[PDB]
Design an enzyme around this catalytic site. Structure first.
Site, short mmCIF file in Angstrom:
data_model
loop_
_atom_site.label_atom_id
_atom_site.label_comp_id
_atom_site.label_asym_id
_atom_site.label_seq_id
_atom_site.Cartn_x
_atom_site.Cartn_y
_atom_site.Cartn_z
N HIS A 188 0.80 -1.21 0.11
CA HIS A 188 -0.06 0.11 -0.07
C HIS A 188 0.89 1.26 -0.01
CE1 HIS A 188 0.14 -0.59 4.50
NE2 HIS A 188 0.30 0.86 4.47
N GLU A 227 0.67 -8.25 0.62
CA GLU A 227 1.15 -6.99 1.12
C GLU A 227 2.56 -6.71 1.28
OE1 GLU A 227 -1.32 -5.20 0.99
OE2 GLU A 227 -0.13 -3.35 1.94
N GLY A 281 1.49 5.51 11.12
CA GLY A 281 2.76 5.88 11.25
C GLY A 281 3.50 4.56 11.26
N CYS A 301 3.31 1.68 9.88
CA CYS A 301 3.51 0.53 8.71
C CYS A 301 5.01 0.66 8.27
CB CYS A 301 2.49 1.06 7.57
SG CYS A 301 0.62 0.70 8.22
#
Length: 182
Positions: free
Chosen positions: A41, A72, A146, A148
């Site tokens: 992402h 992911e 914040g 990730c």
């Protein structure tokens, strides 16, 4: 404060950079040579900022499992003039549960941040922001915007990178040794 934080600190000090894309600032784990990982992402393009230096992306691959399900993780090869310490021997070979993990973050907003998250469950399937996602680890800590890309470690192992939360729990994508054979 203890041996878990010692291992986490050893990884953060040699194997992390600050990555910036158009979708924000992320902790980025360097694995070997010029190869690093980041949550998918982050939407990595042809150019990324690495410690505030404009850097060409030589390759980026959004991993999916052999059911064509999102994992992911994006593996990025950076046109950087320096190699990472090779940490592939700290990656697990199989999906597993863990005791006593630490989540570590290093960004402009959160420098030198370490969180003892405790027990880590092999959670498996998660609908992550509407995307069916596999190989998810879960810990019972109210992680926030914040974090990730944050590194999940136990003593002697780098097991995941933080990709989301629901306000009460946090979620990491598994790192496996098999992702980084060359």
């Amino acid at each position: 404060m203890g041996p878990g934080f010692d291992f986490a600190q050893a990884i953060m000090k040699k194997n992390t950079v600050i990555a910036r894309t158009e979708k924000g600032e992320f902790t980025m784990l360097g694995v070997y040579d010029r190869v690093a990982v980041i949550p998918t992402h982050a939407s990595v393009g042809e150019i990324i900022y690495i410690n505030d230096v404009e850097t060409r992306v030589l390759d980026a691959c959004a991993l999916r499992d052999l059911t064509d399900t999102n994992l992911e993780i994006t593996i990025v090869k950076l046109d950087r003039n320096q190699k990472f310490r090779d940490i592939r021997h700290f990656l697990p070979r199989c999906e597993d549960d863990y005791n006593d993990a630490v989540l570590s973050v290093h960004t402009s907003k959160f420098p030198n941040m370490y969180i003892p998250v405790g027990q880590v469950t092999n959670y498996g399937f998660l609908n992550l922001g509407g995307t069916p996602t596999h190989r998810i680890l879960m810990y019972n800590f109210p992680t926030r915007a914040g974090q990730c890309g944050g590194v999940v470690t136990t003593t002697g192992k780098v097991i995941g990178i933080h990709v989301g939360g629901n306000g009460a729990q946090g979620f990491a994508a598994m790192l496996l040794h098999s992702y980084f054979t060359d």
